[PDB]
Each structure stands twice: as C-alpha cells, then as structure tokens.
C-alpha cells in the first residue's frame, strides 16, 4: 500500500497549502499517516466540519491541484501575513487567494467557473474574520461582507464575524474554510462584497481504496 508519511503536516494543512506542507503538493496515497505532533504554522484558521473535509480528501487520495484562470476584477490579489511567513517574508496558503480592497473600494465580485471536464471538482475556499471594525473597513471597505458560493444544485452564503480571539501567531482574526464540489456540467459562481478568501483552481477527486491513519509509528 502506498503510504504517504505526513511528517509534520496534517492532511488539511497539506490540502490548503501551509508553507511547510508544500512539500506535499500533488501527492497521492493509499494511506496518509498523520502524526500526533503535526502542527500549523500559518494564518490561524478553523474548519466547520473538519471531520468530513478530512474524511473526503483522505478517501479521495490525491492532492493534485489544477490552477484555474479566475479573474479578480479590481481588488488586490495575493495577500500575505507574517503569521504564514513563506520564507524571509510574509505569505499565505499556497492554494488560497486572499483578496483585499482596491484603491478605496471593494466591488461586488461575481465570477463564474464552469465544470467542462468529465469529473467532479473539489473547491476549497474561505472567509476572513477581522477582529476589529478598523480592520474590516480597512481591508474590505464595506464593513459588512458576505460570501455566496453556489452551483445549480447547491448554495452557500457565509457572513463574517468581527471580534476578538486569542492571539494565535500574532493574529486575533481567523479564517473559516468551506468547500464545494462541482459535478460535471454544473457551474461554480463566487459572489461577494468582501472578506472572500478566494480559490485558485480545484483539486481532482478520485474514488478508491484510500484513507488516513493517525500514528507516530516508523514507516
């Protein structure tokens, strides 16, 4: 069985793209082995329904990402942080694209991305949660902010929450990760007015004998 040693990375951090897990880009496994002491060293996040996201990626058995031509009209792309330092400088999750307000306005974004391939697509996206209203309007001029991801079958709208959290890697803001699977012939449509932590393409989904196991046992 193809055993992928997770080293210091959990599956999720290798999925999103935490700098120290980028060594696992596009990897495949039969059995992913997560270590008890694997750690996150990037922007503080949380996953609502971490169990199912982890299950389904584990079962898919692949981290092969396909970068898509998403065009973000009039916003500042590729935001980074010194929480997720990627080298000597600040950075972020290799597969997520932080969008900030351009000039002095965050326009209501409304992109689309059609599944024209003959396979399911896994889309990993998130939402930002500024700890202060300063930060909120500062980053996303709108003070409010909502994310609405959907297809002809599903629909998801996430509303950010401003507030103080414990310091975690400097920060007191967080990012919530969500996901959307696009069935062939369906279309994805990201629609927001701020706080979006946009995707960069999709991960391929495979059905098979793959899974995941927690163990600090030698391989």
């Amino acid at each position, epitope marked *: 069985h193809r055993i992928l*040693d997770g*080293i*210091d990375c959990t599956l999720i951090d290798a999925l999103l793209g935490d*700098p120290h897990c980028d060594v696992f880009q596009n990897e495949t496994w039969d059995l992913f082995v997560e*270590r008890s002491k694997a750690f996150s060293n990037c922007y503080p996040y949380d996953v609502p329904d971490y169990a199912s996201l982890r299950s389904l990626v584990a079962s898919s058995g692949t981290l092969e990402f396909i970068t898509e031509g998403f065009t973000w009209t009039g916003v500042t792309q590729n935001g980074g942080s010194n929480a997720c330092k990627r080298g000597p400088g600040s950075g972020f999750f290799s597969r997520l694209n932080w969008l900030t307000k351009s000039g002095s306005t965050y326009p209501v974004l409304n992109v689309t991305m059609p599944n024209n391939d003959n396979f399911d697509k896994l889309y990993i996206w998130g939402i930002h949660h500024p700890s202060t209203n300063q930060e909120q309007t500062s980053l996303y001029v709108q003070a409010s902010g909502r994310v609405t991801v959907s297809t002809r079958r599903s629909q998801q709208t996430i509303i950010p929450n401003i507030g103080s959290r414990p310091w975690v890697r400097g920060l007191s803001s967080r990012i919530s990760i969500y996901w959307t699977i696009v069935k062939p012939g369906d279309v994805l449509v990201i629609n927001s007015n701020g706080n979006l932590i946009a995707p960069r393409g999709y991960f391929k989904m495979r059905t098979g004998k793959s899974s995941i196991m927690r163990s600090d046992a*030698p*391989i």
Partner: antibody
Amino acid sequence: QVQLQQPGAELVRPGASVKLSCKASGYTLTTYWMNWFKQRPDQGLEWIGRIDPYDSETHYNQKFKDKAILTVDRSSSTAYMQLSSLTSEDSAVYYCTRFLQITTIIYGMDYWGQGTSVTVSS
Amino acid sequence: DVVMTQTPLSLPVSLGDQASISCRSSQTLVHSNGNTYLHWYLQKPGQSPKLLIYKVSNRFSGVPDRFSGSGSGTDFTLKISRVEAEDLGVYFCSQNTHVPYTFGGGTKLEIKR
C-alpha cells in the same frame, strides 16, 4: 515548531570524553532517524553516524567507529553522542539532525540543531 | 566513499545576477529504486545548514522559485536566477544514496557591491 536543542559550547580537557545532548522537540523522536555531523572550521562537514531512536539501531562511519557512541533516551526525547579520548582534531562544531528515512518524500535531513562547539584544551 | 566535488569555490555575483554552483560525484547517485538522493544545503555564516533543494530538483519548504537544481547521475547544479542580498552564504551539495553520506566542500557565494 520542530526544534533540535544543542548546548552551544563545551570545553573538554584532552584525553577525556564529552557526552553531547540534542533534545528533540516539535515532532516524535522515535518516528524518524538521527544523524550526527562534525564540521571542522575549515568548512568540512563529516558524517559521524546514525541512530534509529525507535530501537537504537546505530550505524557509524568506520572512521568514528572507535570514538563516537550514539544513544538516545526515549523518555526525554534526548539523543546523545559520546566522544572519548578527545584530541585537538576533535575540536569542531557538532550537529545532530532529523534524518528523514527513505520512506519519506524527502529522505535527507531537514532540521539541524544549533550545533555545539567542542574546545579540546588544557 | 563518494566524493562530492564542487566548483566554484567562491562565487562573486552582483545583486540581480545569476549564480551557478556545480557538484560532481565520484559515482552515480541513482538509487536502486531509481531515486537520486542528491541535496543542496545553505549554511549562512554563524548558523546551521538549511535544506534548500532535495532529491536534485525539489524545493524544500520555504525556498523561493528563484532557486533551481538539476543533473543526472554524477553532475548536478544549483542555479539562482536572480541573486538577492540575503542569498549571501555557503552552499554544499551532499548525497544520501551511498553510506557514508558525503558532503561537498562548499561554495562560498559573495555579493558584489
């Protein structure tokens, strides 16, 4: 988050021996191998030997066979290296490393300890 | 034992320029599994080495796309397309493939100012 703590500097009288420590933290010692190196001031990086913290299956460079003694104390994640009857030539910076075995995608040492400087002098 | 032979010994490059260190092994570093376990480490003075490129051409975590490696069997090379100020340091090439594991003698990069 993964650290390999070594004591920085040691002064040892010639002929005696020094037991170096290398407190691993951030990961589980046992899960991976460990390599000790020697760097002479000139630059030269020499492999002293290896140890498998799981069982303690060590493997030395023939050159250090009768000098270095690799051991680990799983209890406190502390690997060790004994060098007996040290001489001038043994004054160098000694490094311990996480040698990720052939079953990993890397297979090489990724995290190095800060090094320790062993000054052999009377 | 396998001998890692690096050249240059000192490499004066200027900010923006392209450095290029070369490594040569006394015998193929191809493993019985077909994997070439050749690595490139960077030791900044007064620090411990840092993995830069593993298995000939893979960037270890953190290292930027301006570092590139390549080679086959015995002759491998590291290439910094655009040299920055921080790139200042010493570069070694080592091999796992054969026991005893061996290192190159280092190639001291030096910036031109």
